[PDB]
Design a protein around this motif. Structure first.
Motif, short mmCIF file in Angstrom:
data_model
loop_
_atom_site.label_atom_id
_atom_site.label_comp_id
_atom_site.label_asym_id
_atom_site.label_seq_id
_atom_site.Cartn_x
_atom_site.Cartn_y
_atom_site.Cartn_z
N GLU A 1 -2.73 4.02 -3.89
CA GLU A 1 -1.80 3.52 -4.89
C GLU A 1 -1.14 2.26 -4.34
O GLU A 1 -0.66 2.29 -3.21
CB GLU A 1 -0.72 4.54 -5.26
N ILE A 2 -1.15 1.19 -5.13
CA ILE A 2 -0.53 -0.04 -4.63
C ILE A 2 0.68 -0.36 -5.49
O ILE A 2 0.63 -0.30 -6.72
CB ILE A 2 -1.61 -1.13 -4.57
N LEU B 1 -8.91 -0.86 3.81
CA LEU B 1 -7.96 -0.07 3.02
C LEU B 1 -7.75 1.32 3.61
O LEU B 1 -6.63 1.81 3.72
CB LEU B 1 -8.45 0.03 1.57
N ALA B 2 -8.83 1.98 4.00
CA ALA B 2 -8.82 3.31 4.55
C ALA B 2 -8.15 3.35 5.92
O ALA B 2 -7.40 4.27 6.20
CB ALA B 2 -10.25 3.84 4.70
N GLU C 1 0.98 -4.70 3.65
CA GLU C 1 0.56 -5.59 2.57
C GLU C 1 -0.93 -5.55 2.27
O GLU C 1 -1.75 -5.36 3.16
CB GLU C 1 0.93 -7.04 2.94
N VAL C 2 -1.25 -5.73 1.00
CA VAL C 2 -2.59 -5.92 0.47
C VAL C 2 -2.56 -7.04 -0.58
O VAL C 2 -1.61 -7.18 -1.35
CB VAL C 2 -3.19 -4.63 -0.11
N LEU D 1 0.83 -1.20 0.00
CA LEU D 1 0.00 0.00 0.00
C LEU D 1 0.86 1.25 0.00
O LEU D 1 1.44 1.68 1.00
CB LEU D 1 -0.93 -0.11 1.21
N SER D 2 1.05 1.96 -1.11
CA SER D 2 2.02 3.05 -1.10
C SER D 2 1.45 4.37 -0.62
O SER D 2 2.07 5.08 0.15
CB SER D 2 2.59 3.28 -2.52
#
Ligand SMILES: Cc1cc2nc3c(=O)[nH]c(=O)nc-3n(C[C@H](O)[C@H](O)[C@H](O)COP(=O)(O)OP(=O)(O)OC[C@@H]3O[C@@H](n4cnc5c(N)ncnc54)[C@@H](O)[C@@H]3O)c2cc1C
Length: 374
Positions: free
Chosen positions: A35-36, A200-201, A209-210, A16-17
């Motif tokens: 952005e990933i 995600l939020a 990690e995602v 997760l950038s």
């Protein structure tokens, strides 16, 4: 390129950038630009694809549910071949944030809930209670003792969520961008949220990690022929693939005209990626844009209202062979935008209701009318 072994059940563990709120400080809604990083994975996608994202439930929600049920959280449970303590099974493998009439009906039935039982087999009462009351609030409001196996048996398995990709690899490389409206609401005084969008939020810091995969959509694609005009209709988070479309056309330096139709409550708070669009308009890649701000005045304005008001120019673009794209809420937006589009085709272009019907249909078969609604 020469292989790619990631897919829904064998996802790429990515990083997760960027996790950025793109709505204003007083917006009613929280939207994240995410952005990933794809690293050296070699994962590829096209504008129009979606990103599949696995999530885990909020640990605090899991603890809440389990304590309401008189459970400890440990308690071995078996899930698709593997024995897990209750808490880990619920966090990783079961949906907790989407109630359904059947779940409501089986809980009621299972626990013999004096207050939920009158809904049983009452059809639309069940669907209305489930849309209105999350599962944890359903048992908060009518708690009962359950064994760990009875619980997990009530529940549906956790599945990934789809997000339209908001970037083009022609521009971005090594990366995938997504536009996530995070589902937040309260229930009789308690803060609730959607599973994946709040994961995600809120529950992965930065570069954490995602688990990710590409869902290809070959029925939602830019024209071949960079000279072809494209009209994009994407209110709210429906804007996302249109950010992918413009990155692509800017990158390929397509001379084709581009028209964007966007709507949302407030200019001031909810103009997603607005600096990007203003730059596109200034660099002349974005030819036109029409904005619909729902709550900026007394009367409600929507994209479909701009489509009608922009009728004669829209028609001019259609006959020049434009491709039309619709993305966003299907439940109400897609239908009203379609009727505005039938109204415009009749209005300008040689009316007759029936013949406009026929025309919109030849457009779809020609790939000139495409939608991605949810
Ligand atoms: C092809 C595709 C493209 C998509 N693209 C995007 C995208 O670009 N960006 C994006 O944001 N989404 C998009 N989504 C939708 C995304 O897949 C999710 O469905 C969305 O993020 C919600 O997921 P969630 O897990 O956060 O929530 P879930 O947990 O599934 O949430 C379910 C919702 O939370 C509750 N609900 C909502 N508010 C209330 C309330 N007031 N009272 C009680 N119940 C309530 C549940 O009932 C309601 O059904 C896309 C969908 C598809 C199919």
């Amino acid at each position: 390129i020469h292989t790619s072994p990631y897919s829904k059940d064998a996802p790429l563990v990515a990083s997760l950038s960027v996790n950025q709120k793109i709505t204003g400080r007083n917006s009613e809604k929280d939207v994240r630009h995410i952005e990933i990083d794809l690293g050296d994975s070699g994962l590829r996608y096209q504008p129009g694809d979606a990103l599949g994202v696995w999530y885990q439930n909020d640990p605090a929600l899991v603890k809440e549910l389990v304590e309401l049920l008189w459970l400890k959280g440990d308690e071995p449970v078996t899930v698709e071949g593997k024995t897990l303590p209750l808490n880990e099974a619920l966090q990783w493998h079961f949906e907790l944030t989407v109630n359904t009439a059947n779940i409501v009906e089986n809980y009621a039935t299972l626990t013999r809930s004096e207050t939920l039982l009158p809904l049983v087999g009452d059809k639309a009462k069940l669907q209305h209670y489930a849309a209105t009351t999350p599962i944890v609030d359903m048992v908060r409001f009518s708690p009962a003792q359950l064994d760990a196996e009875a619980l997990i048996n009530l529940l549906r398995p956790l599945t990934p969520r789809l997000y339209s990709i908001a970037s083009s690899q022609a521009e971005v490389e090594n990366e995938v961008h997504v536009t996530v409206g995070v589902v937040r609401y309260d229930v009789e005084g308690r803060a609730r949220a959607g599973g994946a969008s709040s994961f995600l939020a809120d529950r992965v810091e930065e570069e954490g990690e995602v688990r990710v995969f590409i869902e290809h959509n070959d029925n939602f694609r830019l024209p071949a022929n960079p000279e072809t005009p494209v009209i994009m209709i994407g209110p709210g988070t429906g804007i996302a693939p249109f950010r992918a479309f413009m990155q692509q056309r800017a990158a390929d330096e397509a001379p084709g005209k581009n028209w964007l139709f966007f709507g949302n409550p407030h200019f001031t708070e909810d103009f997603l990626y607005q600096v990007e669009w203003q730059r596109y308009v200034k660099e002349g890649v974005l030819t036109r844009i029409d904005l619909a701000w729902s709550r900026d005045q007394k009367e409600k304005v929507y994209v479909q209202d701009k489509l009608r008001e922009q009728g004669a120019e829209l028609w001019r673009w259609i006959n020049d062979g434009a491709h039309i794209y619709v993305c966003g809420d299907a439940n109400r937006m897609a239908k009203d935008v379609e009727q505005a589009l039938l109204e415009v085709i009749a209005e300008f272009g040689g009316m007759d209701t029936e013949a406009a019907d026929e025309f919109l249909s030849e457009l779809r078969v020609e790939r000139r009318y495409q939608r991605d609604v949810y």
